[PDB]
Amino acid sequence: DNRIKTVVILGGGTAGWMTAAYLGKALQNTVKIVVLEAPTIPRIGVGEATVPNLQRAFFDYLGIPEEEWMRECNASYKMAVKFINWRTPGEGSPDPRTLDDGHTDTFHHPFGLLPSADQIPLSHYWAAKRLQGETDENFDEACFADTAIMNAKKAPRFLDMRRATNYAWHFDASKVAAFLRNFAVTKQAVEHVEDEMTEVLTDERGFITALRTKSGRILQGDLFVDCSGFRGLLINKAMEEPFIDMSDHLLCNSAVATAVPHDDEKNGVEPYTSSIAMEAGWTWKIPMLGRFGSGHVYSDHFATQDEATLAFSKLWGLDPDNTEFNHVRFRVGRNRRAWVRNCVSVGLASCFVEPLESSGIYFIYAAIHMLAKHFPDKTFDKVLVDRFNREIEEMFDDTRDFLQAHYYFSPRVDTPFWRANKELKLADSIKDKVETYRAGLPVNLPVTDEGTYYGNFEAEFRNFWTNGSYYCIFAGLGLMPRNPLPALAYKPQSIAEAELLFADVKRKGDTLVESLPSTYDLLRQLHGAS
Amino acid sequence: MDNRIKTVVILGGGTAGWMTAAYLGKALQNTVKIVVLEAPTIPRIGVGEATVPNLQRAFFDYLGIPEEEWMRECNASYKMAVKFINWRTPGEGSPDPRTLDDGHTDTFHHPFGLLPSADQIPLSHYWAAKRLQGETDENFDEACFADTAIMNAKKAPRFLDMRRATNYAWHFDASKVAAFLRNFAVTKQAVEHVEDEMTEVLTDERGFITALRTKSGRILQGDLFVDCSGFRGLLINKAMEEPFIDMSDHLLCNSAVATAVPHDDEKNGVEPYTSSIAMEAGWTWKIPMLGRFGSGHVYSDHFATQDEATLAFSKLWGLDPDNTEFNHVRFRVGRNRRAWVRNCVSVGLASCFVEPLESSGIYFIYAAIHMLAKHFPDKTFDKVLVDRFNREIEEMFDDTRDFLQAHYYFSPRVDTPFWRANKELKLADSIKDKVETYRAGLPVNLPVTDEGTYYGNFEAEFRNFWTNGSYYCIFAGLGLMPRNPLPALAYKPQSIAEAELLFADVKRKGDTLVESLPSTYDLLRQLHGAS
Ligand SMILES: N[C@@H](Cc1c[nH]c2ccccc12)C(=O)O
Ligand SMILES: N[C@@H](Cc1c[nH]c2ccccc12)C(=O)O
């Protein structure tokens, strides 16, 4: 037995309690787990978005039924990120402007995988017609039935809780953290130490030996997980790991946020996250029953905090001198190495991007998954540490690049912020993808059906942003292949087979818009709200 | 404004030419003219060729050709693995395995399929923990694949009622498959078969091929040229001047001598596997078919003269050299700098080649034609289409080159100059990195799909052709072990217990299928209708 005997987790919230609950299950009670969490007040009433795998990879793994946790954190349903005013100039508005072709300036980024004909994804048949002037229809409407469901504000489940389509979650992050704290402590023997850390003790080879607390207790441990946030109190402050600032890829570094109560009865509830474009950034809208979380992500180089606060407030018609705000300074980038010696960073302590495509919870889950996969013993085999690190850096940079493309290919040039994005360089990896996409080839072609993709985290992790996602953003923003996929010009039978798939999308969207409940109605039932 | 390719000309027949022609016959939906230029071919000995499981799904099903139909026309038999005999022990070649110092025969299998997992960890890792901690005496192949038991009994991968029992692939006479596909393409896809010799490759001011001149006087116009001319690469290397990258710094064998050996099936049964029988200056393949097996001694002509190698090959099988028909081949091992250049796409040996240690030949052809259809161009030859095709071929090839190198690099044999010379070669960075991952006890190329998807969708398998299970078969088979168990297993007593159920499953499937399956021989006699 040269095994890890105690794991000490610094920090609560989602990172700390997801780590704690996950390792509780994965390590089968053979290790003592400690969470050191200073007592704390949540800033807002705010919300957070997730991706489809969360129930299966995380909550199902812990034996936690979906509705149980959803009832304890006022969770709502998400079928996409919906992008608003990303192609057109001017002051932020919650309502879409009009493109030349007469379409609203909106595009959706839904979940699921596109169907193929003759091994060619439906996207490619749509781009063919579009480039050959045989359709005016937009990509999201043509290729995803879920677009029609979201436009109608219908739910992803019928009233009888039968599944209609793919989806993920909006929730109050404070409540999920509290739910998981309760689960960890009462079902998994986690020691919750409610105290502030006052010192990190390290031996001579630079391994952490214990955390000192203000009350005087010394929490010994063998492995330490830094879930302390942007301060990186173990990984950066104690281990002295450099952070790599990546503002040369993404300009937004700040947010001003609040919870907006909302007339659900009057407006319905939107089953999607919104990205509402602003002059020096964007604003998120994350609906839950009774209120929506919202924040204006911005670059402090192009808007002062006061300018942001005023434009944020104007967008929602809020009284700026009479609203509660949470002002956040983002650290954008990742550590040079996520895991150093016996210190593993998870969450904001590890790495961070603006929540433009719901990265936060997923980054946490992926690290925890990878830490269990590469779980060490006390020798801390350097190969295990390196392979963990490679996964995390590939994960992060891939998503960083993907986000950068949202800005780089926006056709907006109306403010210095929007023009400045285009003076940045795209990383080599995403420049290559764009070149592939421009030639009409697929990018990151899905090779599995949806059951396997969302059934096995390793399949999804290997191909997180699929061809369908690259089409959602590039074609939503107006970036098109130079010409159709050339193979299509030889495949008249395949083009016909694709027309059946297009008709399938129309029909499913039609029938489900008829049969589905409103998201409002589904939530009133799920949360028993009078 | 119409820049479509209208004519495809394929130089060369054989498997490469006729698979390319039949496949594009389907893929281009009769919108292109397809021309195959092939010299009148003299019969060759069916020295036998092995395959991998995807061939029926990806290639024959795709064309609407039933498995039994082509097999009955190609003297095909069944393959459940490659089996390595005497790769760990010294001495002259023998078909019979020598005895290791632990009393086992010197054999290890490389079967198909994907290993199951418990708690997301492959069964291999549970076997390795037990092996390293003195808790099992069983070899990796016997512990983790039921197919090992089935092969040891020479049972078939199907029941007589033709229900599938396990994974498998095919042994066939390569000439008969080319003849079969030629007939198909000529009679059902209107391919123009020009039976004639090429005398000149015509090129324009851009370096693009415009036509192939033939001895009879045809000038075969084309828009796209596929080079299936073999090792001489008459289009890709000679006309297009693309250099070939010799890779003898990773694999030493460069030669083969081969023959077909009539076989007493009744007495001996038929082995449902390819054998790789280690020799002093290389190895010898055994590829069973009905009534005979194809065999070939692969060797380096630096360590064995042709005559020396022929004599050793004859002695292995008890053949009389002056009553035996031999086929002699000098390989070109490695790949072109670029597989596709301008309007010339190389396929088969004209593109790249390794010795058939893990049955790569047909697989490389199929993979290239799949990728050609996917990247099919128009007359503008978008440089990005060309480049992405080349990237897939080079990655496919170097990955396999490296896997093959590991067979030799990790052989403990030191008894001849050949076996020692392999271990003075360097491992490429990619495979070194995998070995380091493996030695830490971590998975290598973890399977992320079930077999249905993996074998149902070529692109799934192409993204992960050599999975964790394959690396274990070769590394553990040769005796390279992790430095220590996967360390996560020290914390997972419940997962270890599930894996015990998985080891039980393997034993149960092996016990019950060996009792219930028919011999390979008997299933072959039923399939082929033998008297
Ligand atoms: N792998 C993600 C891709 C995805 C699609 N739409 C998204 C919106 C937000 C974030 C991720 C996504 C998934 O299928 O779930
Ligand atoms: N992807 C191949 C890998 C493989 C396993 N065993 C083999 C033996 C020979 C050649 C390839 C293989 C398959 O599963 O079919």
Numbering used by the authors:
A (entry chain B): 2 to 531
B (entry chain A): 1 to 531
What is the paper's account of this structure, in its own sentences?
Structures of Thal and various FDHs including PrnA and PyrH were overlaid and analyzed. Superposition of PyrH, Thal, and PrnA structures showed that the three residues (Lys79, Glu358, and Ser359 in Thal) are found at the same position in all of these enzymes. Moreover, the halogenation sites of the substrate are all placed next to the side-chain of Lys79. We noticed that the space between the tryptophan substrate and Lys79 was confined by the surrounding residues in the pocket and were not large enough to accommodate the larger sphere of the iodide species. We modeled HOI into the active site and found that the van der Waals sphere of the tryptophan does not allow this putative HOI to fit (data not shown). The tight space between the halogenation site of tryptophan and the residues lining the binding pockets would not allow HOI to be accommodated. These data clearly explain the results in the HOX formation section which show that although HOI can be formed at the flavin site, iodination of tryptophan cannot occur because of the limited space in the tryptophan binding site. We believe that future efforts to widen the substrate binding site may allow some tryptophan halogenases such as Thal to catalyze the iodination reaction.
Here, we investigated the reaction mechanisms and structures of tryptophan 6-halogenase (Thal) from Streptomyces albogriseolus using stopped-flow, rapid-quench flow, quantum/mechanics molecular mechanics calculations, crystallography, and detection of intermediate (hypohalous acid [HOX]) liberation. FDHs belong to the class of two-component flavin-dependent monooxygenases which require a reductase component to generate reduced FAD (FADH−) for a halogenase (monooxygenase) component to catalyze halogenation. Several X-ray structures of FDHs have been solved which showed that all FDHs have two separated binding sites.
